[PDB]
Paper text:
S-layer proteins (SLPs) are self-assembling, crystalline proteins coating the cell surfaces of many prokaryotes. We determined the atomic resolution structures of all functional domains (I-III from N- to C-termini) present in the three S-layer proteins SlpA_ac, SlpX_ac, and SlpA_amy. The Lactobacillus S-layers are anchored to the cell wall through interaction with teichoic acids (TA), either lipoteichoic acid (LTA) or wall teichoic acid (WTA).
The full-length SlpX_ac shows differences in structure and domain arrangement compared to the SlpA architecture. The middle domain of SlpX, SlpX_ac_II, exhibits a SlpA_I-like domain fold and an additional repeat of the SlpA motif. The four residues observed in the vicinity of phosphates are conserved with the proposed binding motif of YxY….KxxN. These residues are not conserved in the third SlpA-motif, which is present in SlpX_ac_II. However, SlpX_ac_II contains an additional 3rd SlpA motif and an additional loop region, allowing for increased protein flexibility to incorporate into the assembled SlpA-SlpX S-layer. In summary, the atomic structures of Lactobacillus S-layer proteins, SlpA and SlpX, along with the observed differences in their domain organization, enabled us to generate a self-assembly model for SlpA, the main SLP. This model aligns with prior studies and suggests a domain-swapping mechanism that enables the integration of SlpX into the S-layer.
Residue numbers in the entry: 189 to 298, 301 to 362
The structure:
């Protein structure tokens, strides 16, 4: 009830209205995982924090009470339990699940420099933005073809960003 600490979380900087308890997140094989601040497979930053109560916005202490997460192997899942403790010792827990997936990123090779383009309707314009050989990016599932050339939309930030970055490379 209302007097217990409240756990808050943001995904991609946006406050979330659904409770952290019960969430299922994807985390990439090989990643460093902190259960209070981590990046999901699609590049969205997830930050968990707490306040004293529903109505009291003062900092409340929060820590992982159970964190067996191991990112070494894809196809495994782990439950994380977080405990928030108010200044008079009331407690709230949330348990979320982490699925270890393979990387959703792709490596750009191109020649050392990869040129980018912006697309509006059926028009391809040059973009000054360049990637270096070896740079890793998320890639939109939706490609676009202009003049029989295929282009992929990309972002180094997130899969979501890649769908609207209007930074395109030639699909290889």
């Amino acid at each position: 009830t209302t007097q217990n600490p409240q756990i808050n979380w943001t995904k991609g900087g946006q406050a979330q209205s659904s409770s952290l308890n019960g969430q299922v997140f994807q985390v990439a094989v090989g990643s460093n995982f902190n259960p209070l601040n981590f990046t999901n497979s699609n590049g969205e930053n997830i930050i968990v924090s707490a306040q004293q109560s529903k109505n009291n916005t003062t900092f409340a202490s929060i820590e992982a009470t159970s964190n067996p997460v191991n990112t070494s192997e894809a196809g495994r899942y782990y439950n994380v339990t977080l405990t928030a403790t108010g200044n008079t010792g009331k407690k709230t827990t949330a348990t979320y699940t982490v699925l270890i997936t393979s990387s959703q990123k792709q490596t750009l090779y191109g020649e050392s420099t990869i040129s980018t383009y912006s697309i509006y309707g059926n028009n391809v314009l040059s973009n000054s933005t360049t990637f270096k050989d070896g740079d890793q990016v998320y890639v939109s599932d939706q490609t676009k073809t202009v003049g029989g050339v295929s282009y992929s939309q990309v972002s180094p930030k997130s899969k979501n960003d890649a769908n609207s970055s209007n930074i395109w490379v030639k699909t290889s």
